[PDB]
Amino acid sequence: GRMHAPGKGLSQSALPYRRSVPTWLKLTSDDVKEQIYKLAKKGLTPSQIGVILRDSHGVAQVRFVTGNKILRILKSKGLAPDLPEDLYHLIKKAVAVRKHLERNRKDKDAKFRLILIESRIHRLARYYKTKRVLPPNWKYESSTASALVA
Amino acid sequence: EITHAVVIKKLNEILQARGKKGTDRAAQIELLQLLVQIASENNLGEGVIVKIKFNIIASLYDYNPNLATYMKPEMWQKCLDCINELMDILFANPNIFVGENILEESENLQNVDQPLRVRGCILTLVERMDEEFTK
Amino acid sequence: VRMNVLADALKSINNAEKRGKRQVLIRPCSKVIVRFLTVMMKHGYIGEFEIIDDHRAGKIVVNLTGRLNKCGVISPRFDVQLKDLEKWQNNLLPSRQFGFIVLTTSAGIMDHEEARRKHTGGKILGFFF
C-alpha cells in the first residue's frame, strides 16, 4: 500500500459508468473555459480549480463538458507553471522541516521523516526528467530547494 | 500601518475562515475592529475603509448560528451604529469607493469582478436588516 | 502489484470448485484469460461465462461444474520446439490419454494437440486436466 508507511487503506473516488451531461446543466464548453482562466490568476492551482467548480457550480467534472483536462486547457494558453504542483508541495514541506531541524537538533524524529520526503522528491524527479518535462541537468539540493519554492 | 498591503492581505486572511467549524464567531468582528481604531491615516482614505466596513458589519451579521432567531438588542444597536457610520463615509465624499479609478488611491478591485454590486452591497445589507427587524 | 494476472485468476476457480460452488467472480479481466477459458470450455470442463463490462478493465463471472479437477499456471513462459513437447507433457499431465497443455503460437492460442497438426511451437502458458 503506502510507500513510506506500512499502512493500507481505501478512500479512492469512484466515478459513475454514465457520462452524458447529464442533461441538466449549462455553460457550453466555451463558458467553462473563461470560468477557469479567472481562477488561475488568483493562484488557484489545477486541483483546487476542479474542486471550486464541482462544489458550487453545475459541473460534474470538466472532462465531460470539455474534450480536455483542466491542465491541458491552461497549458494551451501558455499560462501553466514551469513545474507541477505535486513536486512543489513536496519541496514546500521539506524547507520548514529543515528550519525546525536547525532550531532543534534533538528532534531525531523530524530528521528521520526528512529522509523519506527527501528520497520521495528524487524518485518523482526521475519520472518527469526522463519524459522531457524537466531539463536533463536539474538536480535537487539545499540551494535549489530554497530558490525554486520562492 | 504601512500602505494598505499587509493590511489588505490580513483582510484576505481574516475573511477566509468564514464558515468552518472553528470560527470564534465574534472575535472576527473584534479583529476587524482591530484594523480600524488602529487605522488613523490619511487621504488614503477617508477612503477605502468603507468596504472593510461592509465586510465588518457583515461580521455584525454572520455571528448568528442560523436563519431563525432574533438579534440580541445590543447586537441590534451595534449593527445600527455600524450602518449609520457607513452612511457618514458615503455621503461626504463622493468618490465611489470600491471602484471608479482616480489618481489612484488606493486599491485594486477593478480586477475583481465589478466595483459595483460590491458597490450595490449597501442595499443588500439594508434589506437584510429590514428582514432582521421583521424577525 | 499483481505482476501476472492469469496466475492469480486460476487459483480462485481452483479454490472455488473444491469447496463446492458454481459461480465465481474473477478480476481484472484480461483478453488472455478469455481465449484460455474458450478452449477450456470446448472440451467441457466449464460452462458458459458472462463478461461484465466496466471501463476499468471489466470483471468476468463463470458457471462451472465438478468435471474440472485443477487448472494451474506455469510461469515464466518457456519455449517449446515440438521435441521438447513430450518431456513437458509427461511431467505435467496425469496420463497420456487425457489432459491438455495449453500454449500460444503465431497461429493463435490453442491446446497442444492442435499445435502438433499445424507444426507450430511457441510459448507455454498453463495446463489443466
Binding site: L10, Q12, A14, L15, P16, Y17, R18, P22, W24, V51, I52, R54, D55, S56, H57, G58 | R18, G19, K20, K21, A58, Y61, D62, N66, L67, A68, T124, L125, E127, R128, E131 | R19, G20, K21, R22, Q23, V24, L25, E50, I52, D54, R56, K59, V61
Partner: protein, 84 residues
C-alpha cells in the same frame, strides 16, 4: 456464505449496501441538490459533500460547512438530487 449464491443480479440494497468499489459497477454515494432558500433568492446547485464554504450573494454569505463527509447545510430547505 450458503456456497451456491447468485452474483449475476444483486438485491436492490441488501447486496448494494456494500462498499462502492466492491460492487459490480462502481457507483458514487453522493448526489447534487438544487436549492433556493430565502437568505439568497437564487436557484443554486451544490454538491452534497461541499468540502468548502458555499457563499451567498444575498443578505447571508454562508450556506454550507465542510465536515468530515457530507456537508451540514443550514436553515434553508432547497432539495433535489435530481436523478443521480
Amino acid at each position: 456464505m450458503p456456497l451456491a449464491k447468485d452474483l449475476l443480479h444483486p438485491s436492490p440494497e441488501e447486496e448494494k449496501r456494500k462498499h462502492k468499489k466492491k460492487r459490480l459497477v462502481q457507483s458514487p454515494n453522493s448526489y447534487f441538490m438544487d436549492v433556493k432558500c430565502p437568505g439568497c433568492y437564487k436557484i443554486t446547485t451544490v454538491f452534497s459533500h461541499a468540502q468548502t464554504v458555499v457563499l451567498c450573494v444575498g443578505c447571508s454569505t454562508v450556506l454550507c460547512q465542510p465536515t468530515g463527509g457530507k456537508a451540514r447545510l443550514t436553515e434553508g430547505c432547497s432539495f433535489r438530487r435530481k436523478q443521480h
